[PDB]
Subunit: 240 residues, 4 copies
């Protein structure tokens, strides 16, 4: 009964929270990102609550679309996964006129192109497997994909892309028993919010969101059966 979950960006931040909660719920968590020693440290702290439950690391750089799509170096085959949380990502703030090409192109690759490739691999491997209860693909998006802001043009594009991907995959994959959703965080207390503050946004709830709140939404989704094609916004009201 321990099912496998793949969580990109599980070495820190929201992805580590997500991985922690899924482990406490009995999932066997594969965490994937670049920083191998950090992934090892997280893996060693993920709880073990069920017989058979095993956690894994995958050193994967999402700049490398071919590696992502081919499950290069992955500890388990793509066919093993019942849950895929696409959480890794990069944010860059710049006027579009001054945004260095190597940077925004890299961000688009990590945030959109590599997730497409990973999703394709997982879907190919699991579409026709029999299941009692739905598999789950969950993308971590951002309030910025739905409400525009200055200086985040390509970032917003990348995540809006994910949202459109999600909607269409939900329609495609519902009849195969795969449910597909986004969780959309607001300003969360992670390294990604170094140099920004919740007060620069027009927020109904004026403060920081903890990583726990984002993982709570993921856990809600993974436990659900009738939710697909949607976003769950955990954003202190930003998109209101």
């Amino acid at each position: 009964p321990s099912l496998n979950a793949l969580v990109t960006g599980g070495s820190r931040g929201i992805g580590e929270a997500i991985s922690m909660q899924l482990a406490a719920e009995g999932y066997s968590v594969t965490i994937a990102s670049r920083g191998l020693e950090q992934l090892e440290a997280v893996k060693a702290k993920l709880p073990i609550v069920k017989q058979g439950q095993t956690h894994h690391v995958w050193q994967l750089d999402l700049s490398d679309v071919e590696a992502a799509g081919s499950f290069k170096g992955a500890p388990l085959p793509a066919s093993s996964y019942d849950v895929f949380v696409s959480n890794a990502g990069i944010s860059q703030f710049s006027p579009i006129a001054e945004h260095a090409d190597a940077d925004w192109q890299n961000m688009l690759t990590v945030n959109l192109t590599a997730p497409i490739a990973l999703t394709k691999a997982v879907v190919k491997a699991i579409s026709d497997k029999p299941r009692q209860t739905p598999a789950h693909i969950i993308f971590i998006s951002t309030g910025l994909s739905k409400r525009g802001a200055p200086m985040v043009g390509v970032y917003s594009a990348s995540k809006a892309g994910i949202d459109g991907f999600m909607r269409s995959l939900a329609r495609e994959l519902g009849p195969k028993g795969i449910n597909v959703n986004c969780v959309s965080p607001g300003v969360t207390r992670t390294s990604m919010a170094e140099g920004i503050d919740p007060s620069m946004f027009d927020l109904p709830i004026n403060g920081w969101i903890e990583v726990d709140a984002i993982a709570d939404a993921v856990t809600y989704l993974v436990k659900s059966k009738n939710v697909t094609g949607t976003t769950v916004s955990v954003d202190n009201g930003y998109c209101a």
Copy 2:
């Protein structure tokens, strides 16, 4: 520690399941609707898990806006509530041209005007009360408020109105420590599904939604603190 939750339409269907789950979580639930025999029956089954937790019935016809706004006959004052779930509603299916005025006007009053008056009362009563964590106002909407369909003009209008109200209230009330959201069901196995069935719709997930799936989303929201101004859709991909 037992907080008070008001659930309109708590005597059957989705409202019964929401009441059962809030009660399991420790809330003292007041259920409000017309049918006194059925309200007493549900009250008797609501879980008691915390010392001091007690449930209540309120015989209330939401076509009487003045009774609703003044908490006429209520067991507790509006000031007592930390959760209000506005669930009661009527649905009518008709070409607009043939929709009897008395019918659509009563549906608009139950589904939108009465919830505005209830919400006013609660907000006036609780806005300045000190709270450690936010109070919750949660409206039960429908997929039809976001994606149009034939023969549901006024039903859609009433629930889209609720949505609009929700988003403005979330902006207004966030600084007062009240979070406001909608949960949007799809075609769920209730008395309202005399008339319609999941096959009439093009659904990513075929089949009926059970009432507890809708209540799961309400439960998730009540336990959250960083979610406001949103819809949680539990619709089998209807709005995807």
Copy 3:
């Protein structure tokens, strides 16, 4: 060949501008609102650009749902109309807790209930008339129906309800040759914006919108035949 258009709130503001543009385009315009002498003054100024074109006035108080729904006092029967622009409206700013019941209830009736009744009457009268090109039903909404703000709960709910109504009517009436849309103004230089200012909002385009710009969107829609179920937002980027 002068087609007939009905514009509620034609006596000043947006509705006057809409009436002026449709008259310059050759429509025979019926302007409806409470101020009969004001309506007569506007009708006397509406351009006459071809033979057969005639304008008309309707003294109509949208607080009276039955008068609206029966076309009481209308100069032409509902069957005469090819274009219906639902423009008249009231806005009220208040904290929900302090919003006087007679005021918000009247605003809900003028902005939502009366328009449903007018729309029913028109649809009943023209649904089965043969048409070479589509008839148009166009509601004037507001950016606040899509992006929440404080102090506008019931105003927002009324206009969001119009949006929901529009989307369902577009689905119901497209196969009958009636296209149904909204135009959504932002802060426009009318009597409604006395005491507010474009600067209170967080606008990409920081200044006033002239009533001409709203009318231009209505003109575009009335000449269109493949646009239905949509909002055309003319809001200086409010909803961006």
Copy 4:
């Protein structure tokens, strides 16, 4: 006084229609795409209505991001443009599990990465230029960016990405006198719709949309000054 307009994909289909309309309105039109002889044929057919109006061709493959971002081979400097319509695009229908990588990657690049690069070049060149009325950037998106469908995962992602870009840029660039919007076509009678049919979709208006209808929305937007951050949907109801 002929303003310049850049139209990608101006050799056929919607882009040809847009170029024709802008040319009849007095714009000097640069049409850009791969097929040079086809471009020259269209340029020869573009109306000349005004002294000073000149049309131009640019051979540009949007699979080459560096070419696009550098204006390689362009007839005029990026600083010459008052209107940029990003219309070129590719659609591909496939189950995601079977969607060839070279195909979906090239689609993403032509639909999203290369328009980002072009936009960057235009914005850098014109941001600080003095203007009496706004410049316009217009992206051609699709109903599929907003309402999911099976077999169009990456296509939808690419266009939803453009929508997210658009909303961010509208916020960024509004204060610079640049308005930014999308036009969203439905099933339109072009080479992209060979194989697909309006009857495969659940349409309020069951028929083909002509290219003229899409161009009419573009024309409306180019003549507007208070519209930014929005989509104009010309989709026969698809998104309703």
